[PDB]
Swiss-Prot record, chain A:
It comes from Homo sapiens. GO terms for cellular component: cytosol; extracellular exosome; extracellular region; ficolin-1-rich granule lumen; membrane; nucleoplasm; nucleus; proteasome accessory complex. The modification Phosphoserine is found at residues 202, 204. GO terms for molecular function: enzyme regulator activity. Found in skeletal muscle, liver, heart, brain, kidney, pancreas, lung and placenta. It comes from the Eukaryota. Component of the 26S proteasome, a multiprotein complex involved in the ATP-dependent degradation of ubiquitinated proteins. This complex plays a key role in the maintenance of protein homeostasis by removing misfolded or damaged proteins, which could impair cellular functions, and by removing proteins whose functions are no longer required. Therefore, the proteasome participates in numerous cellular processes, including cell cycle progression, apoptosis, or DNA damage repair. Binds to the intracellular domain of tumor necrosis factor type 1 receptor. The binding domain of TRAP1 and TRAP2 resides outside the death domain of TNFR1. Residues 464-484 have a biased composition (Basic and acidic residues). This is 26S proteasome non-ATPase regulatory subunit 2. Belongs to the proteasome subunit S2 family. Residues 549-694 are annotated as: Required for interaction with UBLCP1. The lineage of its organism: Eukaryota, Metazoa, Chordata, Craniata, Vertebrata. The modification N6-acetyllysine is found at residue 392. GO terms for biological process: proteasome-mediated ubiquitin-dependent protein catabolic process; regulation of protein catabolic process.
Swiss-Prot record, chain B:
It is found in: Cytoplasm; Nucleus; Membrane. Component of the 26S proteasome, a multiprotein complex involved in the ATP-dependent degradation of ubiquitinated proteins. This complex plays a key role in the maintenance of protein homeostasis by removing misfolded or damaged proteins, which could impair cellular functions, and by removing proteins whose functions are no longer required. Therefore, the proteasome participates in numerous cellular processes, including cell cycle progression, apoptosis, or DNA damage repair. Residues 1-11 have a biased composition (Basic and acidic residues). It is a lipid-anchor. Transmembrane segments: none annotated. This is 26S proteasome regulatory subunit 4. ATP binds at residues 134-141. Belongs to the AAA ATPase family. Coiled coil: none annotated. Component of the 19S proteasome regulatory particle complex. The 26S proteasome consists of a 20S core particle (CP) and two 19S regulatory subunits (RP). The regulatory particle is made of a lid composed of 9 subunits, a base containing 6 ATPases including PSMC1 and few additional components. Interacts with SCA7. Interacts with NGLY1. Interacts with PAAF1. The modification Phosphotyrosine is found at residue 347. Its main location: cytoplasm. Keywords: Acetylation, ATP-binding, Cytoplasm, Deafness, Intellectual disability, Isopeptide bond, Lipoprotein, Membrane, Myristate, Nucleotide-binding, Nucleus, Phosphoprotein, Proteasome, Ubl conjugation.
């Protein structure tokens, strides 16, 4: 019209086409082009506000985007009746995509505020009420795909439109960096459960059909996988050759080949150190000496015979680390020893864990992928023989570690048979017992299990176990973000919050320093004692900066309880890498005059922070650690704990044969460490030797 | 909570703000308040006496001349100048064309901080910073790494200039400028630029002249020499031409790396302008083949100036247009500007 080409700048040329609409339709863009093309003219981009409506109703595309570059506003609300809107929008949907990638094969757009913002602004009304399946599927743009989805449960989002491997490589890569901040990640194939045949088959189809370059993610996948669950479900999903792929499965030759490679990257001293300690006969500690020979040998039977014959003396809990080496020796590859491993169980009423519960733990933990399936039914049948003598307390801690480890989705339920013994009613012993007892049975994930076990146990309620009971629901759902919503209670016992922040948040970036720092300053006294315990999870990213900083003030504190949780906070997550600050800090720590095991628990556990399963041949020399443990053992003089510490640094020191690292790069979590490490907090007598299994 | 309503009667409500003089081992702390008054103050409260140090703003209670505690000190007009950050608004996407120079010193500025393992095993270490020089922007050439060092740790820019900064000299309060900014973070980068000492028109006010400008530079050495400083405070010096530093001054630093950037070539100038215009061009359409071919030669300084006036003269048309008779006439002004001093020489 003539008003659009006026020299005056007076408003407005917007929305004026709604008043008189059908009449201006008689004209065409031929009147509009001389005003916008000629320079030194008024209403250049202002005339596009009326033109964006004419090009939209005429289905012309790439013109509406070019005219909306300056506008950026009227594109949202534009003329209401939805039928003309959703009609031309699908014409605009399919019509803009054909204007892109016409070369063909990119060049890509060219998130830009023109193309990506216009499809995002219109996507509002798209995700509001009508239609479905906007240009994000048609154009295949991964940039708009991040803005395509809306807040929803991601469990059903694991499926996508199938395409070529070329585009799927970039699709899964850019969808991964979107899901690293999201609770669910592509790595969830481990955790989930699921358990359907979909992920097992699709996991083996990414390397299909090439069996040569498949060496990665297949050959290195089966050998580094300790559990049979990944080697069972994927066995039916692996079609290569026929029936003979089991040689690289079951962890028979798998664990044997990587163990020989650990010897090539090893090794650990055998004759020198052990036979020299044999002239010292048996130390008065009866604590860390058994687990030594466990990981070391592996496989040799002569060292296994000294274990057995000795521990028939039955003295105290010393049998723990020993019989744990009975199975682990032959089980280093496969199967193994699972026949005579469970024989001492019924051969030794327990009446406690330190007597017959040792060998009963052996078959459970040393299993590592069994099931198979005889070991499952064997462990359940073996524990049903001993009930009143176990009873509900001491051996009920380790028994769930023989099932939930291998299979989180196992159909066999061992909880109901054990839960009938809770009639002992003891609130004290049940603390460290029922904590990991109900939690380590299975990973669950159906939300129905935690509701069941809450009604049958409580009944009522235990007034104590209900603390640790709700933490299982926090452990059940992994980093689902429901945990920050579950901490609003914040009971005076405070055990809820500390276990909630650690396990309830798993992500690459911490982001928890705002909440973790708030609970310690706003929390009641004595809570700061258990605050560092959350450092075993969220600190796996950059433990160097944040950990030793705050723990430096907590290490010199005179309170023995907080100093016991300080060195533990660093602990394993802080022992991954060495440094000169860690070695220089070791000075003056062992020079303290303080008594009690907290003194040597601070210094000696930090001696294992110099490396994990590395050396000594190749690489770090053992003479440096030998002179350190010898000079510190000359004090007191015994103080038998000086014989505990010098054998403590060689627990993980001389074991080797396992590189962890992390464990693990696949992002699982060790269920034996988080279990046992919570007992040393109210440490009394034998709760420290249960942790010595590691 | 209760300590707020308890000690308030023990100190206040009224009190005074004095200064600290000296401390005696008998717990009597001599303080001095305006004007010319001393006293013996023995207080066990809230101290913290070790962190104080004299010259402090420490309070003095009215009854009777006792120090209950401290609040804070701002202090002086001197701190309000810089106000951090500086944040990386000078971007590596504003520079380009230099390769052999950009590789070497990138290590020295990144040699501290990351990769500490082989840095501490050395134990000698080069914690001297670096040194820059050269016209017009040869010192500004690697300044882009100093702003690239603003993405982590901390940066400081101190204008050396010539006259306005005088003082005793004694350099008393400029060491304060370096010290107060390092107290916030304590990594540091300290940058000095444009030393005019050789190009002075005259001495400023009562300083010297001649040797007293030299002795405050010799004090600039003794500060920087220096006894005794361990950490950083990473020292970076820059100027147009350095005849200044004595053979003694270069030995502490910078004895490792000092830089020289040669005049740009056709590859650098094209990479200078195209990268400078990567954010913003003029009327798009810009081709760099005829730009470096027409004017031969001169630094990439003025190539932005002729483009500054390019869209500026076209702004008489309020956005976009080019007049062939006017553009080459407006280009004649800068073309002759460099064509007045064309020969040297034969600089060769």
């Amino acid at each position: 019209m003539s008003m659009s080409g006026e020299v005056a700048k007076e408003w407005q040329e917007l929305d004026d086409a709604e008043k008189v609409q059908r009449e201006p339709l008689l004209t065409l863009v031929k009147e509009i082009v001389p005003y916008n093309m000629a320079h030194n003219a008024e209403h250049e981009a202002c005339d596009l506000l009326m033109e964006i409506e004419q090009v939209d109703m005429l289905e012309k595309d790439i013109d509406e985007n070019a005219y909306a570059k300056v506008c950026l506003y009227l594109t949202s609300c534009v003329n209401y009746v939805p039928e003309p809107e959703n009609s031309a929008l699908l014409r605009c949907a399919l019509g803009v995509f054909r204007k892109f990638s016409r070369f063909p094969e990119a060049l890509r757009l060219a998130l830009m505020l023109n193309d990506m913002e216009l499809v995002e602004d219109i996507f509002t009304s798209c995700k509001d009420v009508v239609v479905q399946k906007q240009m994000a599927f048609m154009l295949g743009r991964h940039g708009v795909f991040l803005e395509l989805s809306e807040d929803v449960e991601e469990y059903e989002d694991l499926t996508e439109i199938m395409s070529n491997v070329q585009l799927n490589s970039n699709f899964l890569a850019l969808a991964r960096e979107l899901d690293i901040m999201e609770p669910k990640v592509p790595d969830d194939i481990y955790k989930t459960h699921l358990e359907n045949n979909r992920f097992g088959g699709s996991g083996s189809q990414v390397d299909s059909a090439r069996m040569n370059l498949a060496s990665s993610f297949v050959n290195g996948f089966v050998n580094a996988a300790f559990g049979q669950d990944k080697l069972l479900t994927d066995d039916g999903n692996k079609w290569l050759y026929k029936n003979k792929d089991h040689g690289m499965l079951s962890a028979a030759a798998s664990l044997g080949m990587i163990l020989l490679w650990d010897v090539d990257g090893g090794l650990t001293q055998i004759d020198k150190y052990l036979y020299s300690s044999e002239d010292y006969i048996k130390s008065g500690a009866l604590l860390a000496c058994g687990i030594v020979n466990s990981g070391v040998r592996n496989e040799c039977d002569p060292a296994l015979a000294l274990l057995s014959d000795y521990v028939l003396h039955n003295s105290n809990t010393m049998r723990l680390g020993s019989i744990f080496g009975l199975g682990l020796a032959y089980a280093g590859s496969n199967r193994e020893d699972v026949l005579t491993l469970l024989l001492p169980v019924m051969g030794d009423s327990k009446s406690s864990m330190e007597v017959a519960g040792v060998t009963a733990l052996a078959c459970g933990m040393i299993a590592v992928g069994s099931c198979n399936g005889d070991v499952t039914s064997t462990i359940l049948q073996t524990i049903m023989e001993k009930s009143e003598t176990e009873l509900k307390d001491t051996y009920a801690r380790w028994l769930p570690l023989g099932l939930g480890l291998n299979h989180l989705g196992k159909g066999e339920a061992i909880e109901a048979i054990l839960a009938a013994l809770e009639v002992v009613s003891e609130p004290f012993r049940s603390f460290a017992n029922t904590l990991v007892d109900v939690c380590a049975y299975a990973g669950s994930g159906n939300v129905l299990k935690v509701q069941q076990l809450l009604h049958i146990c409580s009944e009522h309620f235990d007034s104590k176990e209900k603390e640790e009971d709700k933490d299982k629901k926090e452990k059940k759902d992994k980093d689902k973000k429901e945990a920050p919503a579950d901490m609003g209670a914040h009971q005076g016992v405070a055990v809820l919050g500390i276990a909630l922040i650690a396990m309830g948040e798993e992500i690459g970036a911490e982001m928890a320093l705002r909440t973790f720092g708030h609970l310690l300053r706003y929390g009641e006294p004595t809570l700061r004692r258990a605050v560092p315990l959350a450092l075993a999870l969220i600190s796996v990213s950059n433990p160097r900066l944040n950990i030793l900083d705050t723990l430096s003030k907590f290490s010199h504190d005179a309170d023995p309880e907080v100093s016991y949780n300080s060195i533990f906070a660093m602990g394993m997550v802080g022992s991954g890498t060495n440094n000169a600050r860690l070695a220089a800090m070791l000075r003056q720590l062992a020079q303290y005059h303080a008594k009690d095991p907290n003194n040597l628990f601070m210094v000696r556990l930090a001696q294992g922070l110099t490396h994990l399963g590395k050396g000594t041949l190749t690489l770090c020399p053992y003479h440096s650690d030998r002179q350190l443990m010898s000079q510190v053992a000359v004090a007191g003089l015994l103080t038998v704990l000086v014989s505990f510490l010098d054998v403590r640094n060689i627990i993980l020191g001389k074991s080797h044969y396992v590189l962890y690292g992390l464990v693990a790069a696949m992002q699982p979590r060790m269920l034996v460490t988080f279990d046992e490490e919570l007992r040393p907090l109210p440490v009394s007598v034998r709760v420290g030797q249960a942790v010595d299994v590691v | 909570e209760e300590e707020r309503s308890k000690v308030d009667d023990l100190r206040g409500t009224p009190m005074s703000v004095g200064t600290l003089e000296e401390i005696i081992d008998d717990n009597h702390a001599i303080v001095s308040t305006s004007v010319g008054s001393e006293h013996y103050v023995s207080i066990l409260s809230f101290v913290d006496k070790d962190l104080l140090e004299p010259g402090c703003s420490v309070l003095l209670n009215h009854k009777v001349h006792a120090v209950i505690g401290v609040l804070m000190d701002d202090t002086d007009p001197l701190v309000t100048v810089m106000k951090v950050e500086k944040a990386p608004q000078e971007t590596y996407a504003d520079i380009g064309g230099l390769d052999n120079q950009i590789q070497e010193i990138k290590e020295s500025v990144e040699l501290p901080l990351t990769h500490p393992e082989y840095y501490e095993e050395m134990g000698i270490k080069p914690p001297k910073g670096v040194i820059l020089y050269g016209p017009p922007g040869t010192g500004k050439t690697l300044l882009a790494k100093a702003v690239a060092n603003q993405t982590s740790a901390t940066f400081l820019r101190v204008v050396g200039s010539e006259l306005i900064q005088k003082y005793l000299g004694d350099g008393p309060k400029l060491v304060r400028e370096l010290f107060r900014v390092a107290e916030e973070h304590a990594p540091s980068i300290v940058f000095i630029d444009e030393i005019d000492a050789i190009g002075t028109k005259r001495y400023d006010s009562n300083s010297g002249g001649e040797r007293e400008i030299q002795r405050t530079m010799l004090e600039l050495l003794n500060q920087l020499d220096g006894f005794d400083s361990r950490g950083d405070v990473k020292v970076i010096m820059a100027t147009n031409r350095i005849e200044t530093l004595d053979p003694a001054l270069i030995r502490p630093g910078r004895i490792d790396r000092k830089i020289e950037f040669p005049l740009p070539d056709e590859k650098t100038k094209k990479r200078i302008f195209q990268i400078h215009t990567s954010r913003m061009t003029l009327a798009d359409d810009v081709t760099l083949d005829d730009l470096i071919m027409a004017k031969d030669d001169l630094s990439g300084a003025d190539i932005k100036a002729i483009c500054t006036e390019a869209g500026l003269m076209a702004l008489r048309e309020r956005r976009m247009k080019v007049t062939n008779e006017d553009f080459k006439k407006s280009k004649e002004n800068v073309l002759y500007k460099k064509q007045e001093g064309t020969p040297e020489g034969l600089y060769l």
